[PDB]
Amino acid sequence: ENKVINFKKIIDSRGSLVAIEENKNIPFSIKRVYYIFDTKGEEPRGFHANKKLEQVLVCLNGSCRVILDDGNIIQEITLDSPAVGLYVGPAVWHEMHDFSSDCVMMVLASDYYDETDYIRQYDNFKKYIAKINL
Amino acid sequence: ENKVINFKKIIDSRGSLVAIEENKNIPFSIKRVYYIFDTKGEEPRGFHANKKLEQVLVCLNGSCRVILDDGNIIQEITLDSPAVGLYVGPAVWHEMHDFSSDCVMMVLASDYYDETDYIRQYDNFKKYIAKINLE
Ligand SMILES: Cc1cn([C@H]2C[C@H](O)[C@@H](COP(=O)(O)OP(=O)(O)O)O2)c(=O)[nH]c1=O
Numbered sequence: 001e002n003k004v005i006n007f008k009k010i011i012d013s014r015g016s017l018v019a020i021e022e023n024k025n026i027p028f029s030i031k032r033v034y035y036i037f038d039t040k041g042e043e044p045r046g047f048h049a050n051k052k053l054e055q056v057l058v059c060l061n062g063s064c065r066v067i068l069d070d071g072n073i074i075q076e077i078t079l080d081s082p083a084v085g086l087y088v089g090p091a092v093w094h095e096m097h098d099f100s101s102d103c104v105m106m107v108l109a110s111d112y113y114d115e116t117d118y119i120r121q122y123d124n125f126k127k128y129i130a131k132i133n134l
Numbered sequence: 135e136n137k138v139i140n141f142k143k144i145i146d147s148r149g150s151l152v153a154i155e156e157n158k159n160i161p162f163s164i165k166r167v168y169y170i171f172d173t174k175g176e177e178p179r180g181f182h183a184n185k186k187l188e189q190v191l192v193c194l195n196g197s198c199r200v201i202l203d204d205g206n207i208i209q210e211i212t213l214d215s216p217a218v219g220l221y222v223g224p225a226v227w228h229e230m231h232d233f234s235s236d237c238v239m240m241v242l243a244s245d246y247y248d249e250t251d252y253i254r255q256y257d258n259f260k261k262y263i264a265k266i267n268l269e
């Protein structure tokens with residue numbers, strides 16, 4: 001199961017543009033937009049999962065390597081094009097690594113920041129899935 | 135003052151984080167998120183106004199020099215910080231200039247793209263506004 005989303009990209013003498021509409025070219029309604037920039041150090045991030053939240057992750061500059069695990073398959077994806085979106089469904093584990101220095105990462109979430117929706121134990125994630133599986 | 139937006143930025147060992155939340159640190163509901171990149175050239179962008187659309191421009195990388203006009207007064211602000219947003223309301227003429235080479239410009243909008251919400255002629259815009267004032 002592929003999670004990548006290629007967005008229609010407009011081009012011209014001016015540059016590029018990519019438009020992202022809730023419930024249109026994305027499975028959900030947008031309620032939060034966030035982004036990580038001016039990164040340093042060599043520690044990855046993420047390593048969590050969400051029970052309700054739905055997201056789409058995009059690398060708008062530079063690139064970063066993403067690992068997705070839906071409890072079925074672990075997928076690794078290097079993002080380095082603002083035209084490629086990565087769908088991170090509920091009950092899916094994710095991690096960011098290899099954040100280039102000029103990297104800008106953006107995330108579109110379907111819901112406000114909720115610390116309580118966050119699974120922080122890979123192992124617990126793995127379990128939560130099982131149950132889900134029955 | 136009512137146009138410029140200061141987003142709470144989070145800085146740590148790892149980097150910086152900024153989260154925008156519909157109707158939280160922005161006056162409207164996000165229906166679409168668009169962005170410009172891989173720019174090049176010396177021909178600007180924008181030069182129109184929208185009738186109902188509410189927007190917010192954010193320079194995620196490099197810089198951009200923007201112009202605003204609500205018919206009334208003219209304003210200019212150079213967006214170069216991911217933490218700064220710029221509110222662009224209905225009936226506001228606008229222009230984007232000087233995109234740095236490494237510029238990423240993002241825009242959060244109230245609704246989906248709609249070719250018909252635009253005013254691509256300044257005079258009509260001016261008119262548009264006049265017509266409004268009377269009201
Ligand atoms: C993603 C996100 C983060 N934040 C805050 C949460 C933290 O205080 C900070 C970064 O945390 P985050 O990278 O999500 O997790 P961690 O605890 O491992 O650092 O940014 C928000 O306030 N809202 C959001 O939507």
Ligand SMILES: Cc1cn([C@H]2C[C@H](O)[C@@H](COP(=O)(O)OP(=O)(O)O)O2)c(=O)[nH]c1=O
Pocket residue numbers: 010017019166168179180246247
């Ligand atoms: C902003 C935006 C533009 N577009 C497309 C429509 C146009 O063919 C193209 C150009 O955007 P625009 O700058 O608005 O106009 P113009 O090309 O006349 O200067 O972008 C979308 O499809 N969706 C969007 O959300």
